[PDB]
Write an enzyme that holds these catalytic residues in place. Sequence first.
Site, PDB file in Angstrom:
ATOM      1  N   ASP A 196       7.063   6.401  -7.162  1.00  0.00           N
ATOM      2  CA  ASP A 196       7.485   5.010  -7.265  1.00  0.00           C
ATOM      3  C   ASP A 196       9.103   4.875  -7.308  1.00  0.00           C
ATOM      4  O   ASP A 196       9.928   5.301  -8.337  1.00  0.00           O
ATOM      5  CB  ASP A 196       6.899   4.233  -8.357  1.00  0.00           C
ATOM      6  CG  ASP A 196       7.112   2.629  -7.581  1.00  0.00           C
ATOM      7  OD1 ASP A 196       5.850   2.115  -8.200  1.00  0.00           O
ATOM      8  OD2 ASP A 196       7.900   2.058  -7.462  1.00  0.00           O
ATOM      9  N   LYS A 248       1.357   0.613  -9.931  1.00  0.00           N
ATOM     10  CA  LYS A 248       2.862   0.171 -10.292  1.00  0.00           C
ATOM     11  C   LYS A 248       2.909   0.223 -11.950  1.00  0.00           C
ATOM     12  O   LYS A 248       3.861   0.372 -12.789  1.00  0.00           O
ATOM     13  CB  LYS A 248       3.098  -1.266  -9.928  1.00  0.00           C
ATOM     14  CG  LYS A 248       3.507  -1.305  -8.709  1.00  0.00           C
ATOM     15  CD  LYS A 248       4.737  -0.559  -8.069  1.00  0.00           C
ATOM     16  CE  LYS A 248       4.674  -0.488  -6.365  1.00  0.00           C
ATOM     17  NZ  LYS A 248       6.353  -0.547  -6.034  1.00  0.00           N
ATOM     18  N   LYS A 295      12.679 -11.153  -4.708  1.00  0.00           N
ATOM     19  CA  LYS A 295      11.706 -10.880  -5.893  1.00  0.00           C
ATOM     20  C   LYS A 295      12.423 -11.672  -7.003  1.00  0.00           C
ATOM     21  O   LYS A 295      13.587 -11.957  -7.226  1.00  0.00           O
ATOM     22  CB  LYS A 295      11.776  -9.224  -6.029  1.00  0.00           C
ATOM     23  CG  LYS A 295      11.545  -8.680  -7.566  1.00  0.00           C
ATOM     24  CD  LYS A 295      10.265  -8.018  -7.454  1.00  0.00           C
ATOM     25  CE  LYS A 295      10.136  -6.824  -8.428  1.00  0.00           C
ATOM     26  NZ  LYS A 295      10.680  -5.653  -8.288  1.00  0.00           N
ATOM     27  N   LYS A 330      10.342   5.431 -10.789  1.00  0.00           N
ATOM     28  CA  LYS A 330       9.848   4.948 -12.031  1.00  0.00           C
ATOM     29  C   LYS A 330       8.937   5.883 -12.635  1.00  0.00           C
ATOM     30  O   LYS A 330       8.700   5.645 -14.177  1.00  0.00           O
ATOM     31  CB  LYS A 330       9.006   3.487 -11.669  1.00  0.00           C
ATOM     32  CG  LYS A 330       9.087   2.543 -12.580  1.00  0.00           C
ATOM     33  CD  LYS A 330       8.647   1.162 -12.142  1.00  0.00           C
ATOM     34  CE  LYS A 330       7.291   1.415 -11.429  1.00  0.00           C
ATOM     35  NZ  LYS A 330       6.412   0.111 -11.240  1.00  0.00           N
TER      36      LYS A 330
HETATM   37  N1  LIG Z   1      10.135  -3.967  -0.016  1.00  0.00           N
HETATM   38  C1  LIG Z   1      11.085  -3.640  -0.777  1.00  0.00           C
HETATM   39  O1  LIG Z   1      12.161  -4.192  -0.419  1.00  0.00           O
HETATM   40  C2  LIG Z   1      10.742  -2.407  -2.153  1.00  0.00           C
HETATM   41  C3  LIG Z   1       9.833  -1.485  -1.831  1.00  0.00           C
HETATM   42  N2  LIG Z   1       9.322  -0.717  -2.914  1.00  0.00           N
HETATM   43  C4  LIG Z   1       8.343   0.334  -2.707  1.00  0.00           C
HETATM   44  O2  LIG Z   1       8.405   1.268  -1.452  1.00  0.00           O
HETATM   45  C5  LIG Z   1       6.910   0.835  -0.770  1.00  0.00           C
HETATM   46  C6  LIG Z   1       7.152   0.346   0.587  1.00  0.00           C
HETATM   47  O3  LIG Z   1       7.528  -0.920   0.671  1.00  0.00           O
HETATM   48  P1  LIG Z   1       8.396  -1.850   1.552  1.00  0.00           P
HETATM   49  O4  LIG Z   1       9.201  -1.477   2.730  1.00  0.00           O
HETATM   50  O5  LIG Z   1       8.753  -3.026   0.948  1.00  0.00           O
HETATM   51  O6  LIG Z   1       6.706  -2.533   1.966  1.00  0.00           O
HETATM   52  P2  LIG Z   1       6.379  -3.143   3.655  1.00  0.00           P
HETATM   53  O7  LIG Z   1       4.789  -3.401   3.319  1.00  0.00           O
HETATM   54  O8  LIG Z   1       7.471  -3.657   3.947  1.00  0.00           O
HETATM   55  O9  LIG Z   1       6.090  -1.475   4.277  1.00  0.00           O
HETATM   56  C7  LIG Z   1       5.269  -0.365   4.326  1.00  0.00           C
HETATM   57  C8  LIG Z   1       4.890   0.016   5.979  1.00  0.00           C
HETATM   58  O10 LIG Z   1       3.922   1.147   5.609  1.00  0.00           O
HETATM   59  C9  LIG Z   1       3.203   0.881   6.586  1.00  0.00           C
HETATM   60  N3  LIG Z   1       2.033   1.537   6.103  1.00  0.00           N
HETATM   61  C10 LIG Z   1       1.039   1.544   5.447  1.00  0.00           C
HETATM   62  N4  LIG Z   1       0.096   2.478   5.454  1.00  0.00           N
HETATM   63  C11 LIG Z   1       0.771   3.336   6.272  1.00  0.00           C
HETATM   64  C12 LIG Z   1       0.392   4.718   6.811  1.00  0.00           C
HETATM   65  N5  LIG Z   1      -0.941   5.285   6.229  1.00  0.00           N
HETATM   66  N6  LIG Z   1       1.211   5.312   7.512  1.00  0.00           N
HETATM   67  C13 LIG Z   1       2.252   4.612   8.066  1.00  0.00           C
HETATM   68  N7  LIG Z   1       3.017   3.756   7.777  1.00  0.00           N
HETATM   69  C14 LIG Z   1       1.766   2.765   6.774  1.00  0.00           C
HETATM   70  C15 LIG Z   1       2.905  -0.658   6.981  1.00  0.00           C
HETATM   71  O11 LIG Z   1       2.760  -0.874   7.938  1.00  0.00           O
HETATM   72  C16 LIG Z   1       4.332  -1.072   6.649  1.00  0.00           C
HETATM   73  O12 LIG Z   1       4.837  -1.491   7.743  1.00  0.00           O
HETATM   74  C17 LIG Z   1       6.210  -0.013  -1.673  1.00  0.00           C
HETATM   75  O13 LIG Z   1       4.770   0.475  -1.626  1.00  0.00           O
HETATM   76  C18 LIG Z   1       6.867   0.213  -3.183  1.00  0.00           C
HETATM   77  O14 LIG Z   1       6.657   1.791  -3.533  1.00  0.00           O
HETATM   78  C19 LIG Z   1       9.781  -1.298  -4.524  1.00  0.00           C
HETATM   79  C20 LIG Z   1      10.844  -2.021  -4.825  1.00  0.00           C
HETATM   80  C21 LIG Z   1      11.171  -2.680  -3.580  1.00  0.00           C
HETATM   81  O1  LIG Z   2       6.295  -4.838  -3.041  1.00  0.00           O
HETATM   82  P1  LIG Z   2       6.287  -3.625  -2.875  1.00  0.00           P
HETATM   83  O2  LIG Z   2       6.988  -3.040  -1.797  1.00  0.00           O
HETATM   84  O3  LIG Z   2       5.145  -2.569  -2.810  1.00  0.00           O
HETATM   85  O4  LIG Z   2       7.276  -3.161  -4.321  1.00  0.00           O
HETATM   86  C1  LIG Z   2       6.675  -3.212  -5.536  1.00  0.00           C
HETATM   87  C2  LIG Z   2       7.759  -3.782  -6.832  1.00  0.00           C
HETATM   88  O5  LIG Z   2       8.168  -5.424  -6.877  1.00  0.00           O
HETATM   89  C3  LIG Z   2       7.960  -2.778  -8.243  1.00  0.00           C
HETATM   90  O6  LIG Z   2       8.856  -3.673  -9.261  1.00  0.00           O
HETATM   91  C4  LIG Z   2       6.672  -2.541  -9.073  1.00  0.00           C
HETATM   92  O7  LIG Z   2       5.208  -3.147  -8.372  1.00  0.00           O
HETATM   93  C5  LIG Z   2       6.618  -3.217 -10.563  1.00  0.00           C
HETATM   94  C6  LIG Z   2       7.587  -2.303 -11.475  1.00  0.00           C
HETATM   95  O8  LIG Z   2       8.876  -2.772 -11.672  1.00  0.00           O
END
Ligand SMILES: NC(=O)C1=CN([C@@H]2O[C@H](COP(=O)(O)OP(=O)(O)OC[C@H]3O[C@@H](n4cnc5c(N)ncnc54)[C@H](O)[C@@H]3O)[C@@H](O)[C@H]2O)C=CC1
Ligand SMILES: O=P(O)(O)OC[C@@H](O)[C@@H](O)[C@H](O)CCO
Lengths: 525, 524, 524
Positions: free
Chosen positions: C311, C360, C403, C480
């Site tokens: 994470d 999470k 967020k 995390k």
């Molecule tokens: N979005 C943000 O700004 C932040 C992201 N994170 C973390 O990072 C992760 C990614 O989040 P985001 O970029 O936000 O999410 P998103 O949901 O914007 O991106 C995920 C990408 O993964 C793809 N995906 C999911 N299953 C897949 C697989 N088996 N193979 C290939 N690609 C696949 C989805 O299609 C998607 O396009 C979250 O799970 C969380 O761990 C945490 C804080 C902030």
């Molecule tokens: O929406 P995403 O891409 O899956 O990122 C998750 C979060 O907002 C992260 O803060 C977690 O779920 C909580 C811990 O702070």
Amino acid sequence: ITSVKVVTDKCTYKDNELLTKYSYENAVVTKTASGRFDVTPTVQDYVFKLDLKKPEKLGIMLIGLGGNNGSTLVASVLANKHNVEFQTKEGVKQPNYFGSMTQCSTLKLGIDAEGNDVYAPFNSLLPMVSPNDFVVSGWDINNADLYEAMQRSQVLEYDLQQRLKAKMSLVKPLPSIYYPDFIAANQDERANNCINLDEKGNVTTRGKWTHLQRIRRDIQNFKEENALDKVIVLWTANTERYVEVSPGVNDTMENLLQSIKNDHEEIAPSTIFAAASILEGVPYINGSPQNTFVPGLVQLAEHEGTFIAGDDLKSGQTKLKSVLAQFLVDAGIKPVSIASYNHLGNNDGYNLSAPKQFRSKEISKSSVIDDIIASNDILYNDKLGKKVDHCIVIKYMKPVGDSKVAMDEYYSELMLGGHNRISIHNVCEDSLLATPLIIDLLVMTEFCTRVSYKKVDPVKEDAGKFENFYPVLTFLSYWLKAPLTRPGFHPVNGLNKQRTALENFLRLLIGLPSQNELRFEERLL
Amino acid sequence: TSVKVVTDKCTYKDNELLTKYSYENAVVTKTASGRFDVTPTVQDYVFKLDLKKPEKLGIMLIGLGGNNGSTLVASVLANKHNVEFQTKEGVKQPNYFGSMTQCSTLKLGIDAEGNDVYAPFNSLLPMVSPNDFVVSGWDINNADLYEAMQRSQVLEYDLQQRLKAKMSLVKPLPSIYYPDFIAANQDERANNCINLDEKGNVTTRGKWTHLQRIRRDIQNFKEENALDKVIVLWTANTERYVEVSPGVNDTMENLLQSIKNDHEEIAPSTIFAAASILEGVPYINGSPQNTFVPGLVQLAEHEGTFIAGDDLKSGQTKLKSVLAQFLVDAGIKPVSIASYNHLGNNDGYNLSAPKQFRSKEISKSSVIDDIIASNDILYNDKLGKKVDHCIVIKYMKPVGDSKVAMDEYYSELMLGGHNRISIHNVCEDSLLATPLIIDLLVMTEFCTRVSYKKVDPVKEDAGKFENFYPVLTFLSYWLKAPLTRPGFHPVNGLNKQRTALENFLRLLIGLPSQNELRFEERLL
Amino acid sequence: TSVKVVTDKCTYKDNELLTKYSYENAVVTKTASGRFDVTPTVQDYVFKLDLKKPEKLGIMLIGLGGNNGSTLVASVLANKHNVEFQTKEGVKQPNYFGSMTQCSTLKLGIDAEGNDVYAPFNSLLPMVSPNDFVVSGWDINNADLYEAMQRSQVLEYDLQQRLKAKMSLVKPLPSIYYPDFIAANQDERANNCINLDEKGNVTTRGKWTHLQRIRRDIQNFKEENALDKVIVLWTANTERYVEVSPGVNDTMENLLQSIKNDHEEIAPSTIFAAASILEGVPYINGSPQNTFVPGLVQLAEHEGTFIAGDDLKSGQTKLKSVLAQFLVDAGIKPVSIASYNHLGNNDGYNLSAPKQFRSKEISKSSVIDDIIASNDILYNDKLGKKVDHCIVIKYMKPVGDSKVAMDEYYSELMLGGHNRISIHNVCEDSLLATPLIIDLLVMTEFCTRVSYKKVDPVKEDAGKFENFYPVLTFLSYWLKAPLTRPGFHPVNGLNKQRTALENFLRLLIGLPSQNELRFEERLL
Ligand SMILES: NC(=O)C1=CN([C@@H]2O[C@H](COP(=O)(O)OP(=O)(O)OC[C@H]3O[C@@H](n4cnc5c(N)ncnc54)[C@H](O)[C@@H]3O)[C@@H](O)[C@H]2O)C=CC1
Ligand SMILES: O=P(O)(O)OC[C@@H](O)[C@@H](O)[C@H](O)CCO
Ligand SMILES: NC(=O)C1=CN([C@@H]2O[C@H](COP(=O)(O)OP(=O)(O)OC[C@H]3O[C@@H](n4cnc5c(N)ncnc54)[C@H](O)[C@@H]3O)[C@@H](O)[C@H]2O)C=CC1
Ligand SMILES: NC(=O)C1=CN([C@@H]2O[C@H](COP(=O)(O)OP(=O)(O)OC[C@H]3O[C@@H](n4cnc5c(N)ncnc54)[C@H](O)[C@@H]3O)[C@@H](O)[C@H]2O)C=CC1
Ligand SMILES: O=P(O)(O)OC[C@@H](O)[C@@H](O)[C@H](O)CCO
Ligand SMILES: O=P(O)(O)OC[C@@H](O)[C@@H](O)[C@H](O)CCO
Ligand SMILES: [N+]
Ligand SMILES: [N+]
Ligand SMILES: [N+]
């Protein structure tokens, strides 16, 4: 196109004029030492006349045309009239007038087959001028064109600015009156579009009467250039420093008009703009907190018979503070402390950053908490104490631009020693709430200019002669922080009560009674 | 303080007030060409208000032992006996702050300068003072109320000490405990139950005998204290909803038989409601569960007795509906409104079980949708008609009776703008809930002395006044899920809920609804 | 900007740096009479840092198409091509704000007045610039990255337009989709899968062939772009935990066979990790799920390849641990800490399913308990040793990538007092997560060019440097749930996590750890 038809005999149509009878029920009160209130109902019948022909184009002249509200005002009229959709991170957005009570709020008309409330657009009851029909011009001590102004304000999305750029670059504000002594010292150098210029070197407070004369012709030129019959003038320039009201300068119509001709130091630019619109019969709205409507000028408006209004643009933060304090006070809760803190980074806050323009803002709130207090002597009295401590802080923080970050804190007493602490944090682009407010004000004051009324005597079947609203439109109190008043009445600031007053008014013009909310068809049978 | 209004709409008969009132409203139809046709309507009434008020009013609380129950009895006693008290800030005089009935005022009209004249809300028609309540009630826990104030930690220490001698004499009567209706964790608190099986154990067999032991408690309480007017009010923990089914709780007769048949769908709630009705005692449901199944709404009718309820207007929720309405009325479009909170009391503890939490859930809602509903300029199929919203409450024991409530509103402004408004609220909420409870018993009682008749304009009489519809919808200002009458919409809108009372009080004394035009000032 | 330190602890061999370092620490035992016996310890090391950095570094993202993936590629491109851009506020120059590697400084020492002298964090030992990344990756959705920036609504509109020509050429490769491992609702987004069964349908049969098609994608990407150094990083949606079981994923051999046997406990995550290892490519697990089962930790060892994770340090969570620590260090006792939040992205949307949300949940925790753990003056059996805490995240789509994070701390102060502190935090969190992702690839790479040997004080040699333990715990500042080595405690404490890096960079160039005494000033 939405509309409403009320089957009623209190209303008759004639020559595009609505004639409507209404019986006005109030009650007078005297309170007995033993604490007995003696209440006698009162009643005054009235006949109201609504000229239904609304002007096809309404002229709007802004003092501060070049500012954030000024520019965002023209932008919103242009964008909504020409349906200029614009790109954003969230996509392509359709223009709208959100935040406007006249274009965007609804009003309950009654119920339907099933006891279910039915609502209609506030502006669908009777004919109102649409902001898409404003034709805007105005003045500004600064020559930037309105594209340069949108640029500089940084209120609207960059794509929108780019789509409006061809039309806004063409709007140029007319030269204005710049008297240094009345605004923050730091506005000097913006002042590059004055008409009060001497032989060369420029700026001078000499010639105040010719300045007045010049603003009147600006109004007449603007009217003919646009082939328009109706114009409203609205002040939205920088907050001026209050003027001292003295016996012999501006206490009376005769005194004012002369102190002007005499170039009295107590005649401020807003003083001139006000007297020039009154002298032409065009309604003047004061959107800032300074006291422009001195007794001498209120008199000339009464004598010329012309709509005046304002004392400061009523927030969205200050509004909400009242909704909030009243709710607490009607629930029998006692606010003992209300701390109001504020920062924004626009010219607006740059100008307030001097204590003489900040006092005007501070004096505008100097009555509200005093009105909610008066209404409850069970809570506020000599025994439990009758103050609600309060403060106002407005700081200039440049990096947040037109954003206003507002924070207010309420510390109140609860029963048996408890306390409640409530805090409201509010952030938004200030101009984007101020602009739809400005639009509601113009749109309402134009609606009022077409309304007249007559007192009716029940025994003498037909008396009176149609007259117009008392010059001071307290009807617009809803949008102005310090509601101006006639020399006998205390101001009323209750947000929800000011709006109720407007809807009951519209309601009565089409023959419907005050909303009562009793719902006896549900509550009885 | 009192009020005297000169009108011919009001005649004082025996010790009865007869008031004439003309009810105007309107019916609307919409074309589908965008026109609203509006037909006003009128109905004339006569209202009879028995002006003799019980000089003593009995209040019986289910949950007498909690934070709400305990602090209710403490404020009646402290105010009644003028018990001042010590604090960090100095001696404090007791009061009823937070009570709309005891501490808010009403505009009666204007004096001779044009200025507003307000009067005590409770000075227009006589109402019972909470200083004259006489309180008893039930609780699955036998602690005495001195111990119950201790354990609730809502009130100042030195005031708990000054009331100790009197509060220790009050003990909750035993109650009905059907474990499978509350949060398993309220088990061990249960040491005061009437439903015991010939062993010693709490049973669920014998629901009619528990219904009869409750009527006996209400008769005895009435006898032992010499009072004819009693009101019962549920302030116990939230039960979980029971399922409304055909032939078990749909009608007065099924429900009665069901209780006799020990049916799983009869809850403690249910028994107490029914016992109250059978006794003509008005019953106020201060919690979220669906106690007033249909079957029970009949019985109330039949017996001519009040019922009112579903969840005490958590007042965080108040401030919310108000905020929201202000935004919708100013032409502002909320698109999401996140509501969060925590508190560390039994209240928060009993909600911690999802099933009891599910009751706060839907007792709420139906406010967002009514505000959305009223403004299709903002909410429609083209600009989207939804407002994302959530409700989360977690048990954080360290905070005690304190409730920290947080609400964040994100709204669309003109030309792409947005507004983010957030309300942070900290208070012991028992200190808000208690005055609410008072306001409500004080209004349930008043309503009880009011009757009405639908008159006619050239053919009236045959006479005969009737009682308010059973459901006291005039008490929606204080409940979160305002019980109703079928197909009718549960409109909330605190402010408007308050206009209603005010205008009702006003009419009873022949004063038209307020209108706020201020013609003596606006008109020349 | 560069740094040159005169020390004899460092010799520059080929294009290798050999650094000597003396590791002091201490072992403590406690009496049970309240005495701590402290034995210092020393271990001498030699560190070899290959100073030749790939001039181009390949980054392969699982989830290339999302908010994080998309905005990663946009910031490499915008910064690399200097793409300035238009906004309400004027033209803006791109930057890497938020990146500890590109935008924070480090104290090297003092100048000749006694004042602190700072230098770029990345100017002490050469590191790869994100301007030289070369990015590719996979995504169950085929949209191109221009469309992926559109759909994520994280970046300014006019910068999306200025990058449109370049971002539209990038397309995510297809990926592995085992529907029952994510939130059912991510179904229809899945139009780019390699796991198709001889029909056309996504299957779960053939897990070895999917493992082989991923190694092929990594070889081909390395070939087609002529690069020898590649790093893989999971930024896809949170999977749900898989269950660790004996003889299926406990060991390198069970896990390999399991994948071959199509076992339910092999997740997309798992396959990608394993393919990366098999290729010697370091793998960074940017999500909560337990990808690094034991069985996989072996394989990494065996092959001598990095792995790091669990994470991305949601940085709201950063500010939290820091706040908390400041309170515990000042002698203040938090007793409850409520954490709430909402966001409207796919991220929030995929978490909306409880099973992904549960990841999470526990990736977090283990911070409160470490802070409690370190201060038994505050937390013990007599004053109570707990801190009530909760974590709630709801999907509120209207807010977008924004967020809103809210945290409230209620703490005991001296003699009955309390303190209520609340942190409200609003930002698009992708704009925090992207720089984190950079910081981490930039540090995973550096670590990769560092090796060490445990020396001796009168008997050293035989030689032979070794690689970092597989698990890169130096990257806990950014994750995390800091993966570890058994029985060892996962200490978080961001600040301290940062002291570690800093002191490591420092040592490599023969600079002792900072101590902050400022004797030239404190001492005469
Ligand atoms: N979005 C943000 O700004 C932040 C992201 N994170 C973390 O990072 C992760 C990614 O989040 P985001 O970029 O936000 O999410 P998103 O949901 O914007 O991106 C995920 C990408 O993964 C793809 N995906 C999911 N299953 C897949 C697989 N088996 N193979 C290939 N690609 C696949 C989805 O299609 C998607 O396009 C979250 O799970 C969380 O761990 C945490 C804080 C902030
Ligand atoms: O929406 P995403 O891409 O899956 O990122 C998750 C979060 O907002 C992260 O803060 C977690 O779920 C909580 C811990 O702070
Ligand atoms: N900016 C905002 O968003 C809000 C402003 N308002 C109010 O409206 C007033 C101005 O608002 P902004 O549009 O924000 O401020 P601004 O300062 O952006 O615009 C004022 C304009 O007034 C012009 N001006 C000043 N003295 C003048 C004179 N004698 N003649 C002609 N133009 C003159 C300035 O050059 C400037 O262009 C304030 O006084 C305040 O009452 C209240 C709420 C919001
Ligand atoms: N506590 C407060 O300050 C507020 C209370 N409310 C509401 O009012 C209800 C009562 O809450 P509190 O006074 O706070 O809770 P509490 O948990 O302090 O009181 C509940 C009393 O009910 C008793 N009880 C439960 N099952 C019973 C039964 N079958 N018979 C008899 N008594 C029984 C419990 O023993 C307890 O002593 C809550 O369910 C909620 O509806 C909502 C806002 C604030
Ligand atoms: O400085 P300006 O542009 O005149 O606007 C002034 C404000 O600070 C506005 O929020 C309000 O009228 C003052 C109290 O909050
Ligand atoms: O804790 P109690 O006594 O059960 O009261 C419940 C509440 O805090 C109430 O606000 C409800 O759960 C949520 C609606 O606002
Ligand atoms: N402003
Ligand atoms: N509560
Ligand atoms: N996120």
